[PDB]
Amino acid sequence: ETLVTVKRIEDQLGGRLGYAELDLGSGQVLESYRGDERFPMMSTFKVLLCGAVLARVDAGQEQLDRRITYTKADLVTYSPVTEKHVGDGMTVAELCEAAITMSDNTAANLLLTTIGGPEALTAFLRSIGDTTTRLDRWETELNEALPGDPRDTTTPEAMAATLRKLLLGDVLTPASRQQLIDWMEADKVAGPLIRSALPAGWRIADKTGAGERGSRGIIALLGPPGKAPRIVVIYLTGSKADMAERNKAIAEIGAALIKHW
């Protein structure tokens, strides 16, 4: 029934929907829709970015408390946290927390610089066995979502697989792994999406994205109280829906996969 709901929403909104739900013990796909088609990641890439940063922290190449200085000229659109700290700068950890929790765009660009740019993020991903996902541009041009454009894209199944390696696998140390989950648990801007459908006792760690051409997405580690969690990723692109419609669609898919857990 969840896959029926997905198809009906895609029929209703236009554009394309992508969906993957992953079992964590085996890493096998429980169900997916357009699971091997490419979708723009938008800000959902910011979790992979912070994984790359934490990987450098783990290797002694970076410190969570190192202060990055920047000016007003480095600010791009939608920088709710970094725009308040042009004066005193921010630490690597504060920038990650801003990038994940508020989806601060300058925070992501600042972190991208620390690792060597979008090409270095893609190389990090290749190094951990993701041969599909790719980041090519900076904020905010990576949100352009041109039809057919493979730049800055993932597939629902590949993003699910990579998130399992990062959040539960051995890419990171347990301390850094949990740091990443903790930032995603603290997501502030995902309220109208899967969180709006969560029954009491459920836990979620998530990250949203939004882009041009009606694009929206979410990646999430979630589970019922007392039970094992799963990973879900949902992308949509190519419709004329506004943010609220995009939010509703994702929440409706969340409610269906929750009802059919």
Side-chain angles (χ1 to χ4, degrees):
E1 175 62 320
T2 296
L3 292 182
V4 171
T5 298
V6 170
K7 155 111 163 63
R8 165 216 92 211
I9 290 154
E10 171 183 86
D11 290 332
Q12 266 154 29
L13 287 196
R16 280 183 313 130
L17 265 281
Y19 165 61
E21 175 187 61
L22 210 81
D23 176 276
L24 289 207
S26 65
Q28 85 183 123
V29 173
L30 292 184
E31 43 171 23
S32 74
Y33 186 93
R34 281 178 210 294
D36 71 351
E37 298 195 26
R38 282 181 180 282
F39 289 86
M41 289 176 282
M42 307 150 301
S43 286
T44 66
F45 95 91
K46 283 164 193 187
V47 162
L48 310 186
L49 173 58
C50 288
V53 168
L54 289 170
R56 289 160 39 91
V57 164
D58 284 344
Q61 285 197 314
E62 180 67 276
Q63 291 81 48
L64 284 183
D65 80 353
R66 175 175 76 93
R67 173 162 310 275
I68 310 304
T69 65
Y70 59 94
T71 77
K72 194 167 171 190
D74 299 311
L75 291 174
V76 291
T77 304
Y78 191 68
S79 302
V81 177
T82 47
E83 75 187 10
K84 304 171 168 304
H85 299 294
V86 157
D88 54 327
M90 297 174 47
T91 63
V92 170
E94 286 166 358
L95 288 165
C96 290
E97 170 177 65
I100 293 172
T101 278
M102 305 280 294
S103 210
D104 191 298
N105 281 331
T106 299
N109 277 355
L110 282 175
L111 293 169
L112 277 173
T113 301
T114 82
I115 73 161
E119 304 100 350
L121 181 54
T122 304
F124 169 74
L125 292 170
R126 294 294 176 279
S127 85
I128 64 167
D130 185 344
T131 61
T132 303
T133 312
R134 64 182 290 153
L135 193 74
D136 301 275
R137 284 169 303 185
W138 302 70
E139 292 286 2
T140 53
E141 299 87 351
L142 58 85
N143 302 298
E144 189 177 17
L146 295 165
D149 191 351
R151 295 179 289 181
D152 316 297
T153 63
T154 190
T155 67
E157 292 181 21
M159 175 50 96
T162 290
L163 291 159
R164 186 187 163 238
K165 297 170 169 169
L166 283 180
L167 298 194
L168 302 134
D170 321 88
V171 175
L172 305 174
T173 64
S176 287
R177 213 176 37 201
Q178 195 45 45
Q179 181 57 280
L180 194 45
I181 295 166
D182 273 350
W183 286 324
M184 291 172 75
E185 278 180 357
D187 199 351
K188 305 291 194 262
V189 296
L193 294 94
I194 299 181
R195 288 163 179 273
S196 67
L198 283 191
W202 284 61
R203 57 194 191 271
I204 186 159
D206 60 7
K207 182 65 195 80
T208 43
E212 297 304 312
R213 291 138 173 111
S215 299
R216 199 84 165 101
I218 191 168
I219 58 175
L221 174 66
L222 82 166
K227 309 223 190 123
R230 295 181 181 154
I231 282 169
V232 305
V233 351
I234 305 163
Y235 286 116
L236 55 102
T237 194
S239 54
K240 287 199 276 248
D242 62 16
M243 205 84 56
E245 295 175 280
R246 275 124 89 186
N247 288 349
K248 183 167 172 273
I250 299 195
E252 181 144 34
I253 294 159
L257 71 89
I258 281 161
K259 155 158 172 223
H260 300 303
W261 200 265

PDB file of all heavy atoms in Angstrom, residues 48-62:
ATOM      1  N   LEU A  48      26.162  13.942   4.390  1.00  0.00           N
ATOM      2  CA  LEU A  48      27.378  13.335   3.835  1.00  0.00           C
ATOM      3  C   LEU A  48      28.576  14.243   4.038  1.00  0.00           C
ATOM      4  O   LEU A  48      29.690  13.776   4.324  1.00  0.00           O
ATOM      5  CB  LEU A  48      27.205  13.059   2.345  1.00  0.00           C
ATOM      6  CG  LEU A  48      25.931  12.301   1.970  1.00  0.00           C
ATOM      7  CD1 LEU A  48      25.930  11.956   0.469  1.00  0.00           C
ATOM      8  CD2 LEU A  48      25.796  11.059   2.840  1.00  0.00           C
ATOM      9  N   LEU A  49      28.365  15.545   3.859  1.00  0.00           N
ATOM     10  CA  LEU A  49      29.417  16.516   4.114  1.00  0.00           C
ATOM     11  C   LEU A  49      29.921  16.409   5.544  1.00  0.00           C
ATOM     12  O   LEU A  49      31.127  16.366   5.793  1.00  0.00           O
ATOM     13  CB  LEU A  49      28.895  17.926   3.849  1.00  0.00           C
ATOM     14  CG  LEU A  49      29.798  19.109   4.215  1.00  0.00           C
ATOM     15  CD1 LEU A  49      31.149  19.065   3.491  1.00  0.00           C
ATOM     16  CD2 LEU A  49      29.051  20.399   3.943  1.00  0.00           C
ATOM     17  N   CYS A  50      29.011  16.380   6.504  1.00  0.00           N
ATOM     18  CA  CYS A  50      29.476  16.337   7.884  1.00  0.00           C
ATOM     19  C   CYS A  50      30.136  15.001   8.203  1.00  0.00           C
ATOM     20  O   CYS A  50      31.033  14.946   9.056  1.00  0.00           O
ATOM     21  CB  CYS A  50      28.316  16.646   8.824  1.00  0.00           C
ATOM     22  SG  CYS A  50      27.877  18.403   8.742  1.00  0.00           S
ATOM     23  N   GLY A  51      29.713  13.926   7.532  1.00  0.00           N
ATOM     24  CA  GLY A  51      30.429  12.655   7.649  1.00  0.00           C
ATOM     25  C   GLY A  51      31.863  12.755   7.158  1.00  0.00           C
ATOM     26  O   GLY A  51      32.791  12.247   7.797  1.00  0.00           O
ATOM     27  N   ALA A  52      32.067  13.430   6.025  1.00  0.00           N
ATOM     28  CA  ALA A  52      33.421  13.657   5.529  1.00  0.00           C
ATOM     29  C   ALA A  52      34.239  14.482   6.517  1.00  0.00           C
ATOM     30  O   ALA A  52      35.422  14.196   6.742  1.00  0.00           O
ATOM     31  CB  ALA A  52      33.380  14.344   4.161  1.00  0.00           C
ATOM     32  N   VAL A  53      33.635  15.511   7.115  1.00  0.00           N
ATOM     33  CA  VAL A  53      34.348  16.290   8.128  1.00  0.00           C
ATOM     34  C   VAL A  53      34.722  15.404   9.310  1.00  0.00           C
ATOM     35  O   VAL A  53      35.885  15.361   9.737  1.00  0.00           O
ATOM     36  CB  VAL A  53      33.509  17.497   8.578  1.00  0.00           C
ATOM     37  CG1 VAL A  53      34.112  18.140   9.837  1.00  0.00           C
ATOM     38  CG2 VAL A  53      33.378  18.518   7.433  1.00  0.00           C
ATOM     39  N   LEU A  54      33.734  14.680   9.858  1.00  0.00           N
ATOM     40  CA  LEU A  54      33.998  13.810  11.004  1.00  0.00           C
ATOM     41  C   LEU A  54      35.054  12.762  10.686  1.00  0.00           C
ATOM     42  O   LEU A  54      35.850  12.396  11.563  1.00  0.00           O
ATOM     43  CB  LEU A  54      32.711  13.127  11.446  1.00  0.00           C
ATOM     44  CG  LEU A  54      31.672  14.029  12.115  1.00  0.00           C
ATOM     45  CD1 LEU A  54      30.375  13.229  12.244  1.00  0.00           C
ATOM     46  CD2 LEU A  54      32.173  14.466  13.470  1.00  0.00           C
ATOM     47  N   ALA A  55      35.066  12.252   9.448  1.00  0.00           N
ATOM     48  CA  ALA A  55      36.103  11.302   9.057  1.00  0.00           C
ATOM     49  C   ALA A  55      37.489  11.922   9.198  1.00  0.00           C
ATOM     50  O   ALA A  55      38.429  11.260   9.656  1.00  0.00           O
ATOM     51  CB  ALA A  55      35.856  10.815   7.629  1.00  0.00           C
ATOM     52  N   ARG A  56      37.634  13.200   8.823  1.00  0.00           N
ATOM     53  CA  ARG A  56      38.902  13.904   9.007  1.00  0.00           C
ATOM     54  C   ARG A  56      39.189  14.166  10.478  1.00  0.00           C
ATOM     55  O   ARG A  56      40.350  14.111  10.905  1.00  0.00           O
ATOM     56  CB  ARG A  56      38.904  15.212   8.219  1.00  0.00           C
ATOM     57  CG  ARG A  56      38.978  14.995   6.725  1.00  0.00           C
ATOM     58  CD  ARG A  56      38.507  16.203   5.950  1.00  0.00           C
ATOM     59  NE  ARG A  56      38.930  17.450   6.565  1.00  0.00           N
ATOM     60  CZ  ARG A  56      40.059  18.071   6.267  1.00  0.00           C
ATOM     61  NH1 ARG A  56      40.885  17.598   5.348  1.00  0.00           N
ATOM     62  NH2 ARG A  56      40.369  19.192   6.909  1.00  0.00           N
ATOM     63  N   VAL A  57      38.153  14.474  11.264  1.00  0.00           N
ATOM     64  CA  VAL A  57      38.322  14.546  12.711  1.00  0.00           C
ATOM     65  C   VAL A  57      38.859  13.221  13.234  1.00  0.00           C
ATOM     66  O   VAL A  57      39.815  13.181  14.017  1.00  0.00           O
ATOM     67  CB  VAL A  57      36.995  14.919  13.396  1.00  0.00           C
ATOM     68  CG1 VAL A  57      37.075  14.614  14.888  1.00  0.00           C
ATOM     69  CG2 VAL A  57      36.666  16.376  13.155  1.00  0.00           C
ATOM     70  N   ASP A  58      38.248  12.112  12.811  1.00  0.00           N
ATOM     71  CA  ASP A  58      38.688  10.806  13.299  1.00  0.00           C
ATOM     72  C   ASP A  58      40.151  10.541  12.964  1.00  0.00           C
ATOM     73  O   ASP A  58      40.849   9.864  13.728  1.00  0.00           O
ATOM     74  CB  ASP A  58      37.826   9.690  12.707  1.00  0.00           C
ATOM     75  CG  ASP A  58      36.454   9.579  13.363  1.00  0.00           C
ATOM     76  OD1 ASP A  58      36.237  10.139  14.470  1.00  0.00           O
ATOM     77  OD2 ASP A  58      35.592   8.924  12.752  1.00  0.00           O
ATOM     78  N   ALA A  59      40.623  11.035  11.824  1.00  0.00           N
ATOM     79  CA  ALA A  59      41.967  10.747  11.351  1.00  0.00           C
ATOM     80  C   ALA A  59      42.997  11.750  11.857  1.00  0.00           C
ATOM     81  O   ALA A  59      44.156  11.688  11.439  1.00  0.00           O
ATOM     82  CB  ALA A  59      41.986  10.699   9.819  1.00  0.00           C
ATOM     83  N   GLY A  60      42.609  12.654  12.759  1.00  0.00           N
ATOM     84  CA  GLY A  60      43.502  13.681  13.246  1.00  0.00           C
ATOM     85  C   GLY A  60      43.718  14.835  12.296  1.00  0.00           C
ATOM     86  O   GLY A  60      44.523  15.729  12.599  1.00  0.00           O
ATOM     87  N   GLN A  61      43.013  14.859  11.165  1.00  0.00           N
ATOM     88  CA  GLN A  61      43.184  15.891  10.156  1.00  0.00           C
ATOM     89  C   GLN A  61      42.370  17.148  10.446  1.00  0.00           C
ATOM     90  O   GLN A  61      42.534  18.151   9.737  1.00  0.00           O
ATOM     91  CB  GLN A  61      42.791  15.339   8.783  1.00  0.00           C
ATOM     92  CG  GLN A  61      43.804  14.386   8.146  1.00  0.00           C
ATOM     93  CD  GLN A  61      43.556  14.197   6.649  1.00  0.00           C
ATOM     94  OE1 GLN A  61      42.417  13.994   6.215  1.00  0.00           O
ATOM     95  NE2 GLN A  61      44.623  14.253   5.855  1.00  0.00           N
ATOM     96  N   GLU A  62      41.506  17.125  11.460  1.00  0.00           N
ATOM     97  CA  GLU A  62      40.606  18.238  11.727  1.00  0.00           C
ATOM     98  C   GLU A  62      40.202  18.182  13.197  1.00  0.00           C
ATOM     99  O   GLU A  62      40.254  17.124  13.824  1.00  0.00           O
ATOM    100  CB  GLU A  62      39.374  18.173  10.807  1.00  0.00           C
ATOM    101  CG  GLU A  62      38.362  19.311  11.001  1.00  0.00           C
ATOM    102  CD  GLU A  62      38.923  20.655  10.589  1.00  0.00           C
ATOM    103  OE1 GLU A  62      39.611  21.297  11.408  1.00  0.00           O
ATOM    104  OE2 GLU A  62      38.694  21.062   9.430  1.00  0.00           O
TER     105      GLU A  62
END
